[PDB]
Design a protein around this ligand. Sequence first.
Ligand SMILES: Nc1ncnc2c1ncn2[C@@H]1O[C@H](COP(=O)(O)OP(=O)(O)O)[C@@H](O)[C@H]1O
Ligand SMILES: Nc1ncnc2c1ncn2[C@@H]1O[C@H](COP(=O)(O)O)[C@@H](O)[C@H]1O
Ligand SMILES: [Mg+2]
Ligand SMILES: [Mg+2]
Length: 235
Amino acid sequence: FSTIDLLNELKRRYACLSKPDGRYIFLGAPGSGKGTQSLNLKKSHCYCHLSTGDLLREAAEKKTELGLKIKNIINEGKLVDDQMVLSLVDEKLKTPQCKKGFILDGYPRNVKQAEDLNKLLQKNQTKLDGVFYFNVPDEVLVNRISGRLIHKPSGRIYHKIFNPPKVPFRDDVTNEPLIQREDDNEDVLKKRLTVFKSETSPLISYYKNKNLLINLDATQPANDLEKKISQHIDG
Ligand SMILES: Nc1ncnc2c1ncn2[C@@H]1O[C@H](COP(=O)(O)OP(=O)(O)O)[C@@H](O)[C@H]1O
Ligand SMILES: Nc1ncnc2c1ncn2[C@@H]1O[C@H](COP(=O)(O)O)[C@@H](O)[C@H]1O
Ligand SMILES: [Mg+2]
Ligand SMILES: [Mg+2]
């Protein structure tokens, strides 16, 4: 590790340290690009990526009664109990990775969860900076889910077409195998999009009333959408 390489690390470090702190919510149906954009901000703004889906799939891996309960709810495309998710969010929000800021990706998924989050932020003396809505049509989301591949250890997201890996079905960093999410099966994605429309769509109006909603056109390329999000934050 050279002096030039050492000084260049500092340049990179001082670029994200100089970025504003932020506490945002990414709202949008599965395949909208929430996880993609959360990984971008984690790199550019050092914001914590709080994914309830990731935390619950992790909880679903445990060979306990609670584990089977979560695994079966997840695989059916339905929502886990509000009290359970709240405890996971309350715990991750305490971690030191959330001091610069965070991205809530997958939470809140209903009006009740939005109220719990509100009470939790009030009691913890922390405030949301915005709620980004990933506006993308249903037809687009179908293809987005179909081609999705993830590297389970890192949570890096790929798409067979829109974001392909260097070598098929292998991670770009570790060259380790990729996986298809069990909930990305055609029939359960249909149930997931239904749950979104019924339980999560009223949050658009809820956060618009709270004057926190920021509309995004999530159908644009990922690198273009990244700049648009960064523009709302740093601008
Ligand atoms: N702007 C985009 N345009 C085209 N494909 C995208 C875009 N953003 C993400 N993708 C791909 O489509 C799928 C969306 O994944 P993801 O970001 O995890 O959505 P979500 O987190 O909302 O479920 C992934 O396979 C990803 O590689
Ligand atoms: N906020 C939440 N409330 C309840 N269940 C959730 C929540 N987030 C994720 N889950 C469960 O885990 C899945 C993960 O979805 P995703 O957010 O797309 O990773 C969902 O389909 C639900 O089964
Ligand atoms: Mg599957
Ligand atoms: Mg702005």
